[PDB]
């Protein structure tokens, strides 16, 4: 039983939700968390979707080394100068000092791009589109939290190289849309697509696109996935060049993108859809969509007749026929785990050709005829998915509003909301917003489709260049 309340102390509600759902176990190294099968299976569903989609775009899977040499990492600013403290360094094997220390990838640009330079000697050799599923380490400064901000995490990073800007620019938005599908269609989480401001964008790229999600219970936004156009910053840095097709002896630098998505997805799913009864799984990612619990031989045969029939309609179902646990225990158990539907069968319903289905999201008990099983259970699963998305949508609309001068901006921000405001775009101004609201508010993204069109000649909260989504964030 979960005894914390998401409204009371978010930090202790989250800790008990991830542990009692058997998603997370704690490790003795700060910011490192064990992914138990319940959590890992969600990542695997995400991985199945994204991998298939990027494969349609021509991207191929690979695996590059985890260790990055001091020269390659230092080669040029993959990072900016402040990222250096988050890099973990190996300096010895056993008791023997390494001649030069080696770093654990915090990202793989500096591992991959020297090889890209070797593979590209003509425009024939482009595009290169590689993706890897792997683990990366960042010795994070902020307070660690499972799946939101971890010291080690799992991700996919995609790195693609092109002959022209226009090819690259198209992929950036293709990948971002796929990140948006993961959140919206898989995890039933609504997101805002946008571009990072000068201050918040990756210093190694030209522009950074992003999807931002909102976590009501904290009043904070969070970056869900990232898709950069690196332009020619890295190809100039690593000499990824090909020969001009028309002009003797003349070199062109490749255009590059890089994009990544992490297990942070699962934490956002938890923070958005979790309730005071525990985890709530969107059916699309639930490895168990229906759990069957009997409330011997006659009644179980009915339970297994339901479970074979549900498998026959491609529904992921588990029959919890264990005799060593009381039904009440099972109810609590699978509710904490967030199974979308509990299918209860008692002696009463069996004789009636009946059963009761309990949806995890709303709690309604539904009495359905036995014949009705595959058709009605799948209809409930799709309404749970739609219901979870609709509830989080209307929650996002409620907490994302518009203000046009600083005093109005703060009042909404202090009410636990994020707001789109007319913005200079300049770093000095964004710093000032950061400390005036302080607890300080950051820019989240410049939305592709802002709530309002910017008023003719409107000024920042210099003239305004764009409505920018601001808020307190992770």
Ligand X SMILES: Nc1ncnc2c1ncn2[C@@H]1O[C@H](COP(=O)(O)OP(=O)(O)OP(=O)(O)O)[C@@H](O)[C@H]1O
The residues that touch a copy of itself, with contacts defined as CB under 8 A, are: 25, 27-29, 32-37, 40-41, 43-44, 60-69, 71-72, 84-96, 102, 104, 111, 114-115, 118-119, 124, 130, 134-135, 137, 139, 151-152, 154, 324-325
Binding status of residue 202 toward ligand F99 by CB under 6 A = yes
Q: Which is nearer to a copy of itself, 221 or 317 (CB)?
A: 317
Q: State in angstroms the smallest separation of the CB of 472 from ligand F99.
A: 20
Q: Which does 429 bind (CB under 5 to 8 A by kind): ligand F99, Zn ion, a copy of itself, none?
A: Zn ion
Taking the complex as a whole, the smallest distance from the CB of residue 435 to Zn ion amounts, in Å, to 13
Q: What separation in angstroms does the CA of 47 have from each of 43, 121, 282, 451?
A: 6, 33, 16, 32
φ and ψ at residue 442, rounded to 5 degrees: -105, 160
Residue 150, annotated as binding a ligand = yes
Contact 16, 4 (CB under 8 A): yes
CA atoms within 13 A on the CB side of 354: 10
32 is in an annotated binding site: no
Which residues contact ligand X by CB under 6 A?
Answer: 138, 140, 149-150, 153, 155, 223-226, 260, 262, 264
- Between CA 467 and CA 402 the distance in angstroms is 9
Asked if 104 and 121 count as a contact pair (C-beta separation under 8 A), the reply is no
What is the C-alpha to C-alpha distance for residues 101 and 89, in angstroms, rounded to an integer? Answer: 6
Instruction: Work out whether 458 is an interface residue with Zn ion (CB under 5 A).
Output: no
Yes or no: say if 409 and 440 are a contact pair by the CB < 8 Å rule: no
Nearer to ligand F99, 145 or 258 (CB): 258
Site for ligand F99 in 348-367 (CB under 6 A): none
What phi, psi does 243 have (nearest 5°)? -80, 135
Q: Are 135 and 154 in contact (CB under 8 A)?
A: yes
Does 452 carry a binding-site annotation? no
Question: Smallest gap, in angstroms, from Cβ of residue 85 to ligand F99?
Answer: 8
Q: Which is nearer to a copy of itself, 36 or 376 (CB)?
A: 36
Choose between 200 and 335: whose C-beta lies nearer to ligand F99: 200
Provide the minimum distance between the beta carbon of 391 and ligand F99 in the complex, in angstroms, as a whole number: 30
The span of 176-184, 386-394, 398-406, 429-437 binding Zn ion (CB under 5 A) equals 429-437
| 271 three-class SS | helix
Beta carbon of residue 140, minimum distance to ligand F99 (angstroms, whole number): 9
Segment interacting with Zn ion, rule: CB under 5 A, options 186-194, 331-339, 400-408, 457-465: 457-465
**Residue 429 binds to Zn ion (criterion: CB under 5 A):** yes
Name residue, tokens 């309990």.
358
Q: Work out what residue 115 binds among Zn ion, ligand X, a copy of itself, none; the CB cut-off runs from 5 to 8 Å by kind.
A: a copy of itself
- Give first-to-last CA distance, the chain, whole Å: 28
**Residue 149 is a binding residue for ligand F99 (CB under 6 A):** no
Of 127 and 225, nearer to ligand X (C-beta) is: 225
Residue 447 is classified by DSSP as E
d(CA 149, CA 168): 29
Helix or strand run (H / E) with residue 366 = strand 365-369
Quote the least distance from Cβ 426 to Zn ion, whole Å. 6
Q: Does residue 129 have a cis bond before it (omega within 30 degrees)?
A: no
Residue 67: how many CB atoms within 10 A of its CB? Answer: 11
454 exposure class (CB count in 10 Å sphere: 0-12, 13-18, 19+): middle
Query: Is residue 446 within the footprint of Zn ion (CB under 5 A)?
Result: no
Tallying the residues shown for the chain, one arrives at 474
Residues annotated in a binding site: 107-109, 138, 140, 149-150, 223, 226, 228, 262, 264, 424, 429, 460
Residues annotated in a binding site for L-proline: 107-109, 138, 228
């Amino acid at each position: 039983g979960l005894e914390a309340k998401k409204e009371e102390n978010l930090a202790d509600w989250y800790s008990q939700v991830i542990t009692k759902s058997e998603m997370i176990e704690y490790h003795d190294i700060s910011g490192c968390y064990i992914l138990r099968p319940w959590a890992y299976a969600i990542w695997e569903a995400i991985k199945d979707f994204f991998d298939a989609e990027i494969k349609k775009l021509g991207v191929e899977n690979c695996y590059f080394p985890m260790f990055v040499s001091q020269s390659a990492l230092e080669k040029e600013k993959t990072h900016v100068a402040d990222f250096a403290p988050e890099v973990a360094w190996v300096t010895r094997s056993g008791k023997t000092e390494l001649a030069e220390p080696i770093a654990i990838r915090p990202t793989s640009e500096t591992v991959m791009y020297p090889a890209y330079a070797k593979w590209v000697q003509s425009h024939r050799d482009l595009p290169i589109k590689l993706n890897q599923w792997c683990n990366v380490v960042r010795w994070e400064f902020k307070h660690p939290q499972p799946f939101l901000r971890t010291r080690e995490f799992l991700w996919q990073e995609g790195h693609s190289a092109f002959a022209t800007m226009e090819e690259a620019a198209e992929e950036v938005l293709q990948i971002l849309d796929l990140y948006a599908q993961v959140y919206e269609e898989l995890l039933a989480i609504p997101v805002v697509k946008g571009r990072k401001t000068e201050k918040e964008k990756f210093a190694g790229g030209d522009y950074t696109t992003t999807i931002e999600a909102f976590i009501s219970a904290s009043g904070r936004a969070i970056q869900g996935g990232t898709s950069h156009h690196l332009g020619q910053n890295f190809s100039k840095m690593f000499e990824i060049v090909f020969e001009d097709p028309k002009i003797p002896g003349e070199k062109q630098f490749a255009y590059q993108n890089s994009w990544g998505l992490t297990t942070r997805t699962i934490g956002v799913m938890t923070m958005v859809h979790g309730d005071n009864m525990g985890l709530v799984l969107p059916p699309r990612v639930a490895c168990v969509q229906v759990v069957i619990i009997p409330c011997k031989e006659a009644l179980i045969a009915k339970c297994n007749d339901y479970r074979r029939r549900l498998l026959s309609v491609n529904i992921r179902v588990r029959a919890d026929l264990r005799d060593n646990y009381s039904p009440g225990w099972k109810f609590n158990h699978w509710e904490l785990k967030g199974v979308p539907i509990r299918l209860e069968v008692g002696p009463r319903d069996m004789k009636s050709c009946q059963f009761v289905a309990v949806r995890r999201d709303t709690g309604e008990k539904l009495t359905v005829a036995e014949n009705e099983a595959e058709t009605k259970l799948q209809a409930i699963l799709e309404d749970i998915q739609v219901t979870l998305f609709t509830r989080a949508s209307e929650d996002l609309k409620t907490h994302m509003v518009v203000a046009n001068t600083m005093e109005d901006f703060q009042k909404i921000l202090d009410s636990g909301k994020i707001v789109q405001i007319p913005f200079c775009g300049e770093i000095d101004c964004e710093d000032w917003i950061k400390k005036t609201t302080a607890m300080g508010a950051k820019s989240l993204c410049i939305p592709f489709k802002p709530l309002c069109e910017l008023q003719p000649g409107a000024k920042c909260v210099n003239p305004a260049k764009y409505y920018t989504l601001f808020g307190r964030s992770y």
